[PDB]
Design a binder for this molecule. Structure first.
Ligand SMILES: *[C@@H]1O[C@H](CO[C@H]2O[C@@H](C)[C@@H](O)[C@@H](O)[C@@H]2O)[C@@H](O[C@@H]2O[C@H](CO)[C@@H](O)[C@H](O)[C@H]2NC(C)=O)[C@H](O)[C@H]1NC(C)=O
Ligand SMILES: *[C@@H]1O[C@H](CO[C@H]2O[C@@H](C)[C@@H](O)[C@@H](O)[C@@H]2O)[C@@H](O[C@@H]2O[C@H](CO)[C@@H](O)[C@H](O)[C@H]2NC(C)=O)[C@H](O)[C@H]1NC(C)=O
Ligand SMILES: *[C@@H]1O[C@H](CO[C@H]2O[C@@H](C)[C@@H](O)[C@@H](O)[C@@H]2O)[C@@H](O[C@@H]2O[C@H](CO)[C@@H](O)[C@H](O)[C@H]2NC(C)=O)[C@H](O)[C@H]1NC(C)=O
Ligand SMILES: *[C@@H]1O[C@H](CO[C@H]2O[C@@H](C)[C@@H](O)[C@@H](O)[C@@H]2O)[C@@H](O[C@@H]2O[C@H](CO)[C@@H](O)[C@H](O)[C@H]2NC(C)=O)[C@H](O)[C@H]1NC(C)=O
Ligand SMILES: *[C@@H]1O[C@H](CO[C@H]2O[C@@H](C)[C@@H](O)[C@@H](O)[C@@H]2O)[C@@H](O[C@@H]2O[C@H](CO)[C@@H](O)[C@H](O)[C@H]2NC(C)=O)[C@H](O)[C@H]1NC(C)=O
Ligand SMILES: *[C@@H]1O[C@H](CO[C@H]2O[C@@H](C)[C@@H](O)[C@@H](O)[C@@H]2O)[C@@H](O[C@@H]2O[C@H](CO)[C@@H](O)[C@H](O)[C@H]2NC(C)=O)[C@H](O)[C@H]1NC(C)=O
Ligand SMILES: *[C@@H]1O[C@H](CO[C@H]2O[C@@H](C)[C@@H](O)[C@@H](O)[C@@H]2O)[C@@H](O)[C@H](O)[C@H]1NC(C)=O
Ligand SMILES: *[C@@H]1O[C@H](CO[C@H]2O[C@@H](C)[C@@H](O)[C@@H](O)[C@@H]2O)[C@@H](O)[C@H](O)[C@H]1NC(C)=O
Ligand SMILES: *[C@@H]1O[C@H](CO[C@H]2O[C@@H](C)[C@@H](O)[C@@H](O)[C@@H]2O)[C@@H](O)[C@H](O)[C@H]1NC(C)=O
Ligand SMILES: *[C@@H]1O[C@H](CO)[C@@H](O)[C@H](O)[C@H]1NC(C)=O
Ligand SMILES: *[C@@H]1O[C@H](CO)[C@@H](O)[C@H](O)[C@H]1NC(C)=O
Ligand SMILES: *[C@@H]1O[C@H](CO)[C@@H](O)[C@H](O)[C@H]1NC(C)=O
Ligand SMILES: *[C@@H]1O[C@H](CO)[C@@H](O)[C@H](O)[C@H]1NC(C)=O
Ligand SMILES: *[C@@H]1O[C@H](CO)[C@@H](O)[C@H](O)[C@H]1NC(C)=O
Ligand SMILES: *[C@@H]1O[C@H](CO)[C@@H](O)[C@H](O)[C@H]1NC(C)=O
Ligand SMILES: *[C@@H]1O[C@H](CO)[C@@H](O)[C@H](O)[C@H]1NC(C)=O
Ligand SMILES: *[C@@H]1O[C@H](CO)[C@@H](O)[C@H](O)[C@H]1NC(C)=O
Ligand SMILES: *[C@@H]1O[C@H](CO)[C@@H](O)[C@H](O)[C@H]1NC(C)=O
Ligand SMILES: [Cl-]
Ligand SMILES: [Cl-]
Ligand SMILES: [Cl-]
Ligand SMILES: [Cl-]
Ligand SMILES: [Cl-]
Ligand SMILES: [Cl-]
Ligand SMILES: [Cl-]
Ligand SMILES: [Cl-]
Ligand SMILES: [Cl-]
Ligand SMILES: [Cl-]
Ligand SMILES: [Cl-]
Ligand SMILES: [Cl-]
Ligand code: NA
Lengths: 526, 526, 526
């Protein structure tokens, strides 16, 4: 029986057998006051003693959020949907620790993605018992509020100041600072890791003065705050808060009255109107996201990055080979998970409209000009491939490269990976390739479990990735030093070296997407 | 209703609408005991609690000072004259803060120019509500004593020790250290900025051990302590204190009796005799200025600069294209604001006498030799242009370049600008060009106010300058990172790169006034 | 009336008119318990409150010491003899401060030479009122014990542990740390300066862990611990302590009994037998000097220097053109202050015997071979010049160069001077040239006093040297920045640049005495 005394009370955990060993999991520990009633849309408030043995033996509620009902019954999409009840009372975190209890273990804190509109820490692909077992690190993960409830912003107004879900993540990081030594953890060796919006969140904790001392290093998988979906302008946020108000009959003349009104709405009426706060959306819409609130984020983060105002530490950054494909089946014409999606030039052009709402005509021709000079015009999957690359390069890959470039110019070691392995079990079709989100199960070690029907080459790839992530967290260097592995070079402006992750053998290459990102990065920002 | 609790009591401010937003202004907060009676000519004494809600709702009195009556009725000159009552009771400061109240805002502290003989913080061109509104910085500005009342020196004698007006500025900087967090300010991010004598003052706070920890960075507009008007020798100061005494029938044998006598004179008798403490003056005379007092200034500041004894931090330094023209209408023969001032060779020579009192004949021929080799002797405005350049290069431009050169040799980033835009509203005539003092309204944002009849190109120039000054203060780097702007390089001995500020497009150039300043800087110091 | 409160009591000083200004001198303040009776040969003991206004209005007693009676009546020698009564009660120091009292003045602490056998701080050439007046520094100087009474060593035995006179200097440096702020001094800006044995002492305070935090920078005039006269081996010290014992009928079997016996002898019987503790001496004999005592000096100081174990700071080091001449009239055959001393080859060889006691015959031939290859054999002053250079290069110049070389290799700025001006008033004859000891009056400013019959070129030279020493102390850089002076380069291994000090104009040169010092430094150590 395992009871740990925390600053706020005792917690009981549960033992887990993993790979003939034991991990202790403390699932669903609370880290803030439930943000209900009068606390809705406010910054999370600190938690007071229970006393009391809190039983942390199951995952807690996930935060309220719309769910993906596009493919009912389909594992590829439904695997991302919440797997605990939804509730505004969702501010909990999970701790997994090796057994026997470590002495001063390095801590890995996971921040989930989901567009800032969705996600939960209890997903199966985020289960941190493999990492704790195999690498003897402690893994922590937290639920933070998403959608309007986590990011609604009425700028400067503490009733809805914005970034609440980023302040939830932050209060979780404090909880680790204050409490993790009790579980056997080293609060001085804490690495944040996150994917997509979770990565973008990691990148903003790098810029946030209040997070500076809550962690040591950072890992960004498929995301960074400079991605075009990751920060809402003050203009847009205002328009959106008011549009939500209007749609819920909460329009007022006094803004504090708007918020008061919205605090009376049911979680569901808020969720139902989120999608419409915007005249046209895309499959990549982030209606309620991070904003420059003067608190968490003191200035437009592009200025902070350019001028070197951020936590000085090592970063590990990466992307997958086919980032953009996943999104094309949520609204691009001619695209289906259920056929090979060979689309036409005219369809490609219609797709640009779906993904680039407006976007001058000249803007959209320019994408077309850049991506459709074939070599050569023979290949029927030409336009289908091009639309996926457009969406991935713009939304994920070039913004990750440009973040890494700018961060490293201030003197810190940065490591960049290009993940190019398609899981043998991917439920999505072949044409979608190495999709967004599908490195995650490799990082968390799921392929280490033989009972699971991954290939042997995949077990070995995962084992290597886990070692590299763990050495990065413990030592700031993502090497696998024992098995004559390719040495991972730092990424510098100038050479821009990166490491490819695949089952055959990993290469050092240079200047990923050079020609493409010159387009997105220099020209497109029409 | 906005009340802030300060170390010395409460203060009430007032709300201001600026650009559809709100700024809170706390005008006329006191920062020292009024320096009256027995405190006249003494260092400022700290302030004791009122208690009490101090109403900071209007600008305070300006310090006693002679006024410019050369052009009664004329906006070009009268705009610099005080606009609140004169009084020895003038030790107040102003705070402008964004609304809503910032969390930890960068602070900009303005130090006015006026030759150390005049000036006030309440002038319209020093109004810091635009900066606070637009950049969300806090702006502070203080009145400090000027003329004999601020700088009379009887060396080593604490009844008149010298530099009192520099100690007023310093006590204001402490007040910001102790109190600005209460208004939402970061005392660890404080930038001083000042023009002309205000800049010279900024440059001496860089050398003053007692100011070292009262600020972070420095901006010097048109001035630096090494300018020939900015520091009085001990010889001159003594002669001048005694001359003043003599002129007010205060001559004594005992020096403390001189001061005691002068403490009985009326503000006005002191002001009236200031101009005469010197056998011949120029339009650039600084009769009572900074001195090496062994307290504020521990050694001749040229030695401190050469040998690297100064606060190690970034500086932003600049000058205007026609610095010297403004002065020529206050006594050079043939010059008038009311015609094109085409003067003759013989007039030019008479002008050198006005500006270089004595100055050997050889000294003055040498200026003439250096500035009157025309290319070619055709042009009638030849001599008129030459006299203005003589006066600007000697008094402002070369001393600013040489300061920047010497400061940067010790390893700090320095940025240098050359301001070359003539305001569309300048009341002075065309031949006077881009005058001394007329970048100020651009730095403070006045052209951002459309209701004001500046051109569109001027709004844009001002907006850019404000961003560059603000990024310098917040991040030590005066870049405008968002609008594909010219990147501002650091100034190094060796290349001496500088940025030109004008409405068309800004250039990077090198070695401003190279041939001229070699003359003033190496040879002239005849 | 000027009274200063010190940690140990009050002290009254006296006002002095210097150059139409005022200096306050506190002459003869005590800094330790008188080391009498049972404290003889022991480390100095700290001082307890008097209370009490101590009157510091005259120089105190000088420490017991033999006196130079070679030239009774002659100013050249007698100027170095003590000018206050001799007494074991001699542990006092002097403070000179500018008036008005400075705020946080740099402190210069003088340590006198005299071979560790003689000297006193009250000499006229060490009077620090000119420095205090002219440069507004505070000057401190202390008497420390010399001869057997200051340096007798019975190794490891606290009754006579050795280096007592170096511990007197050290306790004086503490007194400045604890007390000088009260006089207006900055204990964080303290420079030690010393000549000959006083310089050697400065160089050992650089190596002494207990002095590390008692000062900032160091000046070494004509001396450094690696000079062949400056450190006594443990062998020699033992032999000498026992020889003294024997000569005073104090031989015992128990060593503590030897010391007890010697503590009963009269100052005079000790002084009288000092000269004989050694079978043969030279005019440069240092019978009782610094030793490696395991306390002040933890290891042979040559090892500490080579291996970089010393205070890391700037040093200023120098020598005079004719160091060795002064000594030749105290025993070399054919030499006289009263004729031109043209000696013969055979006389030169006899001189080597006087100066190199033993010294194999081969050792002495080798000096002769190195110094007597004339260019050419014509010149009658050939051998007279050669003997002086031998004595100066060996004893002073090469050891100063080698110290500077080795100190600078660890990364600190070092400045080296070669002083080549013969005082217009030197009482010694012309052939003796620029003698040892005769830069001192220039460093202390005596030529600044016109009433004194130095030439105008000498006033100017002294004024420059004073400025350079003062800037070194205040700023770590011995420049004279105002009068277009030659810039003094740092001394590096590799170039070995040095500055010449003379009345005409100073040069930068390289590799002083290169060929000579290769001999003394590499080969001679036969
Ligand atoms: C700010 O909002 C308006 C859209 O107004 C919205 O009303 C909301 C309650 C919501 O239902 C939303 O769907 C609706 O559009 C944006 O301007 C809109 O542009 C289109 C173009 O035809 C119009 O049809 C909309 O009605 C029009 N607004 C209206 C009704 O006046 C506007 O673009 C947006 N600003 C942004 C994009 O930041
Ligand atoms: C691949 O399928 C897409 C997706 O749309 C279809 O899904 C199919 C599996 C099928 O069940 C079909 O009924 C369903 O609508 C096809 O795109 C569609 O093309 C059809 C053919 O006319 C159009 O009618 C639809 O408008 C269009 N769907 C939309 C709204 O995007 C696509 O043609 C098919 N392409 C292949 C096989 O290459
Ligand atoms: C120090 O002052 C004297 C000037 O004496 C002055 O008396 C004052 C009260 C004031 O009224 C002032 O105008 C008057 O000059 C300077 O020397 C002066 O040089 C001129 C040359 O002819 C004489 O006419 C002045 O009278 C003469 N002084 C006198 C009257 O003895 C002197 O230059 C100045 N020192 C400086 C410049 O530092
Ligand atoms: C430009 O004007 C100057 C300034 O002096 C004059 O101001 C004018 C606008 C006018 O009202 C005139 O009365 C006033 O004195 C002129 O300099 C002057 O030149 C005049 C002509 O003789 C002389 O008499 C004055 O001594 C001299 N003024 C002084 C004391 O500086 C100047 O000539 C004129 N030049 C032009 C038009 O190019
Ligand atoms: C250690 O001392 C002896 C010298 O013994 C000395 O007795 C002393 C009291 C003193 O009077 C001193 O003058 C006398 O020499 C040194 O050895 C000496 O070498 C010479 C060579 O002929 C002899 O004449 C000395 O007497 C002889 N010592 C004796 C008497 O035994 C010895 O060199 C010295 N060790 C050193 C130099 O460290
Ligand atoms: C320079 O003088 C030296 C020093 O010795 C002498 O001092 C002289 C001023 C004179 O009074 C003389 O009496 C005194 O002894 C001379 O050296 C001496 O040379 C003499 C000449 O025979 C010898 O007898 C001495 O032994 C020797 N003195 C010693 C002991 O050193 C020297 O000769 C003289 N040389 C010149 C003038 O060039
Ligand atoms: C735990 O280690 C603490 C220092 O941690 C450092 O070492 C590594 C873990 C590295 O990743 C860095 O994060 C850290 O700088 C030490 O101060 C504590 O005392 C230790 N606590 C224990 C063992 O109880
Ligand atoms: C306010 O920030 C403090 C540190 O300020 C630094 O960050 C920038 C503002 C920069 O310009 C530098 O001037 C500073 O080094 C921090 O110590 C305080 O805790 C903060 N105070 C708050 C938020 O209350
Ligand atoms: C006196 O100055 C102190 C710091 O002294 C530094 O500055 C120069 C004097 C330099 O030579 C260095 O020696 C020192 O690092 C400061 O800490 C004290 O507060 C000052 N004391 C006063 C003015 O009372
Ligand atoms: C808490 O849960 C544990 C684990 O299932 C159980 O054994 C324990 O009795 C529970 N305690 C209570 C009563 O909350
Ligand atoms: C807005 O209404 C809220 C309701 O409590 C009130 O607190 C606030 O003062 C009001 N402000 C105004 C006048 O708009
Ligand atoms: C190294 O390879 C071995 C087998 O040769 C494998 O079992 C092990 O897991 C590998 N270690 C890592 C961290 O990849
Ligand atoms: C101070 O001035 C304010 C603003 O005008 C006013 O409302 C307030 O009543 C004043 N308080 C007093 C009586 O000083
Ligand atoms: C000068 O006069 C003042 C008047 O108070 C006095 O304090 C001071 O001691 C006097 N000094 C002298 C003697 O000059
Ligand atoms: C950038 O340019 C835009 C318009 O393209 C302008 O409105 C904005 O004020 C500029 N920003 C700065 C800081 O110059
Ligand atoms: C100390 O000496 C001073 C200066 O000569 C003298 O004025 C004072 O009275 C003395 N005090 C005593 C009695 O020691
Ligand atoms: C030496 O004699 C001293 C005299 O006090 C004594 O203290 C010490 O113990 C003696 N040691 C011996 C036995 O040599
Ligand atoms: C500089 O030279 C001047 C005269 O030109 C002289 O009076 C002054 O003492 C010099 N300063 C120094 C420090 O040498
Ligand atoms: Cl799965
Ligand atoms: Cl087309
Ligand atoms: Cl093809
Ligand atoms: Cl590529
Ligand atoms: Cl105006
Ligand atoms: Cl002429
Ligand atoms: Cl021409
Ligand atoms: Cl130019
Ligand atoms: Cl003398
Ligand atoms: Cl021979
Ligand atoms: Cl010859
Ligand atoms: Cl030489
Ligand atoms: Na040899």
């Amino acid at each position: 029986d395992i009871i740990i005394a925390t600053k706020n009370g005792k917690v009981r955990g549960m033992q887990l057998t993993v790979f003939g060993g034991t991990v202790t999991a403390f699932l669903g520990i609370p880290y803030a006051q439930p943000p209900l009633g009068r606390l809705r849309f406010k910054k999370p408030q600190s938690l007071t003693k229970w006393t009391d043995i809190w039983n942390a033996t199951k995952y807690a509620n996930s935060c309220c959020q719309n769910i993906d009902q596009s493919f009912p019954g389909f594992h590829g999409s439904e695997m991302w949907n919440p797997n605990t009840d939804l509730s505004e009372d969702c501010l909990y975190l999970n701790v997994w620790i090796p057994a026997p209890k470590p002495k001063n273990a390095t801590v890995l804190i996971w921040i989930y993605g989901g567009g800032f509109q969705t996600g939960t820490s209890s997903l199966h692909v985020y289960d941190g018992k493999f990492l704790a077992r195999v690498e003897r690190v402690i893994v922590v993960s937290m639920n933070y509020r998403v959608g309007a409830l986590g990011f609604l912003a009425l700028p400067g107004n503490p009733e809805a100041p914005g970034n609440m879900g980023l302040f939830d993540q932050q209060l979780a990081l404090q909880w680790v600072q204050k409490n993790i030594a009790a579980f056997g953890g080293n609060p001085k060796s804490v690495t944040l890791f996150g994917e997509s919006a979770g990565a973008a969140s990691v990148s903003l904790h790098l810029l946030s003065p209040g997070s500076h001392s809550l962690f040591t290093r950072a890992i960004l998988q498929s995301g960074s705050f400079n991605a075009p979906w990751a920060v809402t302008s003050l203009y847009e946020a205002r328009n959106r808060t008011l549009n939500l108000a209007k749609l819920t009959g909460c329009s007022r003349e006094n803004e504090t009255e708007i918020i008061k009104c919205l605090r009376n709405k049911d979680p569901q009426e808020i969720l139902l109107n989120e999608a419409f706060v915007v005249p046209y959306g895309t499959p990549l819409s982030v209606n309620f996201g991070p904003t420059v609130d003067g608190d968490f984020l003191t200035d437009m983060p592009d200025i902070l990055l350019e001028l070197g105002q951020f936590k000085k530490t090592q970063i590990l950054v990466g992307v997958n080979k086919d980032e953009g494909t996943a999104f094309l089946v949520y609204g691009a014409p001619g695209f289906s998970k259920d056929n090979n999606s060979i689309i036409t030039r005219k369809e490609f052009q219609e797709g640009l409209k779906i993904f680039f709402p407006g976007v001058s005509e000249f803007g959209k021709e320019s994408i077309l000009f850049h991506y459709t000079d074939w070599v050569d015009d023979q290949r029927p999957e030409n336009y289908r491939e091009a639309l996926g690359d457009v969406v991935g390069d713009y939304n994920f890959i070039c913004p990750a490269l440009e973040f890494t470039k700018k961060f490293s110019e201030w003197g810190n070691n940065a490591f960049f990976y290009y993940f190019e392995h398609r899981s043998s079990k991917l439920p999505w079709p072949e044409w979608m390739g190495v999709m967004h989100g599908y490195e995650i199960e490799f990082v968390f070690g799921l392929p280490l479990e033989r009972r699971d029907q991954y290939t042997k080459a995949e077990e070995i790839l995962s084992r290597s990735i886990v070692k590299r992530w763990a050495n990065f967290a413990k030592y700031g260097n993502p090497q696998e030093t024992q098995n004559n592995s390719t040495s991972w070079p730092v990424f510098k402006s100038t050479e821009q070296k990166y490491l490819t992750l695949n089952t055959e053998s990993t290469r050092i290459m240079t200047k990923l997407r050079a020609q493409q990102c010159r387009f997105w990065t220099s020209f497109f920002p029409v």
